[PDB]
Design a protein around this ligand. Structure first.
Ligand SMILES: CCCCCCCCCCCC(=O)OC[C@H](COP(=O)([O-])O)OC(=O)CCCCCCCCCCC
Lengths: 282, 55
């Protein structure tokens, strides 16, 4: 990963490095059993596996309705649902999901709302999404045009659109005429002055004084909300075995940096994923 | 007259034939059960934790 830049979020660049890094000659594991795969294969251990796909798809639905499809836990659940669910069921359920059938507020799946009311609400929600996405696309384009103005922005933009993922991208760019030693030196000067400012005691003290309030307020809030979250968790836990139904534990599974499983190994901790709306991409 | 009751028509087995048939059947069963359930070597497992690979 010598030449891999994590800040770059170009889909093409990430795809090139997905091809480089997840190649089977070096990434395929030999004689390895993953606990996640074993557990999923032990819960539904027969050939008839029609019952796993619905459960994992609904786990992802609840997770991404509570937190949105961009959350890393939601992405993990979506990856597993795709792995273990047959594409016929996935296609049908994705068609329903695109129609706001699984929405938590006005979706008929979770609510007893009649057809006409559901229709009008879903149309309103989809139009809202369309308008917001149009505005967001315009804003993203404008921000991307402005980013290239800055020295480092220009260098990263030129690195991203390089034809092949190289081990030494900046050297290749400066040795091919695409970038200029002068621009590289200017960017390095900007970075050096920023670094010196950060480690300067006086400027760092100024920054700390400027940012102390927000951090302190956030800490106070999320230390106060901890108790109430625990009380809610216990009260819901009283519902675990109240009836024959199964209670949800949103999120079902999270990204585990301490005990990585198959998802973390295959996607490099959620970095190389399909670039479809179900994963929170445009 | 019931001519098929146990008291009629008992033919003792000659000793040589008895011995031969008994030995033959015992050997057949022993050999087949041995080669079917005890000489199964394709169920071979190699315990070696140093053949795993992780990137
Ligand atoms: C067409 C038929 C094919 C199916 C095979 C059936 C073979 C049956 C042979 C039985 C002979 C017999 O009468 O058994 C009685 C004797 C004991 O002698 P006694 O008590 O009658 O004096 O007991 C013995 O002599 C011991 C021998 C029994 C071994 C079983 C037979 C082995 C042959 C297998 C052929 C495939």
């Amino acid at each position: 990963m010598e030449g891999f830049v994590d800040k770059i979020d170009d889909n093409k660049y990430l795809g090139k490095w997905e091809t480089i890094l997840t190649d089977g000659r070096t990434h395929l594991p030999k004689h390895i059993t993953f606990h996640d795969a074993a557990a999923i294969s032990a819960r539904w251990n027969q050939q008839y596996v029609n019952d796993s796909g619905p459960v994992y798809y609904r786990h992802w639905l609840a997770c991404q309705q509570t937190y949105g499809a961009g959350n890393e836990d939601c992405r993990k659940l979506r990856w597993w649902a795709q792995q273990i669910t047959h594409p016929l069921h996935l296609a049908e359920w994705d068609d329903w999901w695109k129609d706001e059938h699984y929405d938590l507020q006005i979706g008929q799946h979770w609510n007893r709302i009649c057809g006409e009311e559901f229709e009008e609400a879903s149309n309103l929600l989809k139009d809202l999404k369309e308008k917001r996405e149009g505005l967001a696309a315009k804003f993203r384009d404008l921000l991307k045009t402005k980013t290239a103005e800055d020295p480092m922005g220009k260098i990263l933009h030129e690195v991203a659109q390089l034809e092949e993922p190289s081990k030494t991208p900046v050297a290749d760019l400066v040795e091919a005429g695409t970038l200029s030693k002068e621009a590289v030196e200017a960017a390095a000067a900007l970075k050096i002055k920023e670094l010196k400012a950060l480690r300067d005691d006086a400027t760092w003290a100024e920054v700390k004084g400027s940012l102390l309030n927000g951090v302190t307020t956030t800490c106070s809030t999320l230390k106060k909300t901890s108790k109430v979250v625990a009380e809610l968790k216990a009260q819901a836990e009283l519902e675990r075995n109240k009836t024959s139904a199964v209670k949800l534990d949103i999120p079902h599974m999270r990204v585990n940096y301490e005990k990585p499983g198959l998802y973390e190994y295959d996607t490099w901790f959620g970095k190389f994923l399909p670039r479809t709306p179900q994963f929170g991409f445009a | 007259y019931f001519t098929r009751v146990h008291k009629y028509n008992h033919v003792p087995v000659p000793f040589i034939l008895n011995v031969g048939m008994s030995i033959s059947i015992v050997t057949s069963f022993v050999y087949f059960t041995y080669t079917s359930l005890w000489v199964r070597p394709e169920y071979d497992r190699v315990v070696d934790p140093s053949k795993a690979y992780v990137n």
